[PDB]
Structure formats: structure tokens, C-alpha cells
């Protein structure tokens, strides 16, 4: 598994002090136990931009709808494989109470099914250029990122499964906010290629878009980086595949060990089955009705997701 949304804090501090200051300011300013975090289901209008250079990349509506279903299961703890969560970690599992719905009104007020399809001469898209997010670079412009979650689906290449933009970048880069997913790994079963065939590449990416970091701290394997979530055990490097429970490492060397089945690890889709309650608090805090960076998304979410 490969994702382009690392936050290697040691590297950022050494090379980009303004970015480092923005992240530390971000972490100092989060108020998880605020009275103005909504208690109700948070509704997210989604628009999926299919950007395709061949027929394989022009994935079906059924395939896209299955991804929306997977997001609703994972973000509402309605995933059947929650039965796989070790009992030692089950008391920490969270229900984000976030719902996703394809948009039914586009930004100019036209009716839509929430899926855009754009043909392109670009053979492979680059995370560095973010070219998939711009019509003039062969991709497709984002839809008002204060009101829609944009999910681009394209050919990212054999190595990258997806990438997201973090919320601390929203103020400086609002037009590229959203998530990009490799077309081979979008939706559940169907055209999705094993072992990333259960729609978890988007769950993981959407977690980044909702302020979560890789559980091991993007620190090359050390015990020094953090994901800023206390209820995710300190972890060395990423886990891949599907380890056996319990897996201990040099950072958490006692049972129940590391939470390799967390969506924010790098394990196979079928190996993942939970967010924690700490991760859920972080995600929902973005919708704080007083200071939540994504609070405007709830104002017209109902109108934008009704035909
Ligand atoms: Ca942690
Ligand atoms: Ca680590
Ligand atoms: Zn990631």
C-alpha cells in the first residue's frame, strides 16, 4: 500500500518552517471537547470526478456507488468486518457518525448524479503537479470545496493508491482540497483489484481529509513521530499485508500491541476494520459550528444531496 499523504514532521521542520508553524498552530488550536461540535450525523455531499484516458479508467456508476456505501459503513461503524476487530481494541472503536451522499445539485445549480466524467490525453497523473484537479492541466476542476468533498478517480500509476489534502492546507490551497484515488482501487469488488478491493483506499484517504495522520507517525520506523491520537498505540513503521493479532513492535512491545487493523495503517483493505474514538473526535471537530474549518459544509448539505 502507498499513499502520498505523509506528514514527516522532522523533515517539514528542517525544510519548511512556515508549514511547520502552520501545523503546530493547528495542533495547539484544536478543541476536541467543545460545546459547539454537533452531536448529530454530519452529512457530506460528494462529487466523484472520473478522469479517464482509456475505457478501463472510466469506471461504472455501480462501482462508484459501492465506494459511497463503503464510506458510509466505515464512517458509521456498520462495516460487517467490525466482527474482526480484536476484543482488546473493540472498546476503542469509534462511530464517526458521518454520512456521505452523492451530490444532486452542481455548483451552478444544475441537476447532477454526483459523478463527472472527463476524457483526457494525460496517460498518468502526478501527485506533485495535482494535475488531475485542473481542467487546464488535463484533469477536472474542483466543485466549491467549502460545500463538496471532491473525489478524483484517475490513473495514478502502479505505485500510488491515492492521496489526500490535509485540512491545515485548506486556507492556502482551497482549490485542491479533496481526495484522489487510483481507479483500480475505487469501490468494492467489481473492477477493483485485490488486495485493495474493498474500498478502504478511499476510507483511509478521507480520514486524511478529516485531519487524521498515518498511525505510525510518518517517521521512517522510529518511535518519535506521532499521529496525535492517544488511543492509537505508538507504532514504529507501517504494517503491510495482514499481521497476526497481537503484533508487538519496539514502540508498543506488550499485548495488545499495535493497531494494524486501523484504517490509517497500510494493511490490506480486508485487514482494516476500525477508527478509534480519538480519531472520531478529531474528525468531528472539523465541523464545530463555531470554529470548525469545514463547518460551512453542513449549511447546504441537505439541499445539495436532494434531487
Ligand atoms: Ca497514537
Ligand atoms: Ca513511528
Ligand atoms: Zn495515507
Author numbering: 21 to 327
Q: Mind quoting what the paper says about this structure?
A:
A variant, in which the general base/acid Glu225 was replaced with alanine (E225A), lacked activity. This variant was used to obtain the intact zymogen for structural studies. Previously, this strategy has proven successful for other MP zymogens. We obtained two different crystal forms for native and selenomethionine-derivatized promirolysin E225A, which contained one and two protomers per asymmetric unit and diffracted to resolutions of 1.4 and 1.6 Å, respectively. The only significant deviation was observed for segment Lys51–Arg55, which contained the final activation cleavage point (Ser54–Arg55) and was flexible. Promirolysin E225A has a compact structure of approximate dimensions 60 × 45 × 45 Å, and it splits into an N-terminal 34-residue PS (Arg21–Ser54) and a downstream 274-residue metzincin-type CD (Arg55–Leu328). Tyrosine-switch Tyr286 pinches the extended segment I together with the upper-rim-strand segment Leu181–Tyr183 of the CD. In the capital interaction for latency, downstream Cys23 Sγ binds the catalytic zinc at 2.11–2.22 Å in the different structures, which is closer than typical Zn–S distances (2.31 Å), and contributes together with the three histidine ligands to a tetrahedral zinc coordination sphere [Figs. 2(c) and 2(d)]. Activation does not lead to substantial re­arrangement, i.e. the CD and the active site are already preformed in the zymogen and just shielded by the PS. Thus, the results herein indicate that latency for promirolysin and uni­cellular pappalysins probably operates based on a cysteine switch featuring a cysteine imbedded here in a conserved cysteine–glycine motif.
Another unicellular pappalysin is the T. forsythia KLIKK MP mirolysin, which protects the bacterium against complement-mediated bactericidal activity. It is secreted as a 66 kDa zymogen (see UniProt code A0A0F7IPS1), which when activated cleaves several physiologically relevant host proteins such as fibronectin; fibrinogen; complement proteins C3, C4 and C5; as well as antimicrobial peptide LL-37. As part of its virulence factor armamentarium, at the site of colonization it secretes mirolysin, a metallopeptidase of the unicellular pappalysin family, as a zymogen that is proteolytically auto-activated extracellularly at the Ser54–Arg55 bond. The catalytic domain conforms to the metzincin clan of metallopeptidases and contains a double calcium site, which acts as a calcium switch for activity.
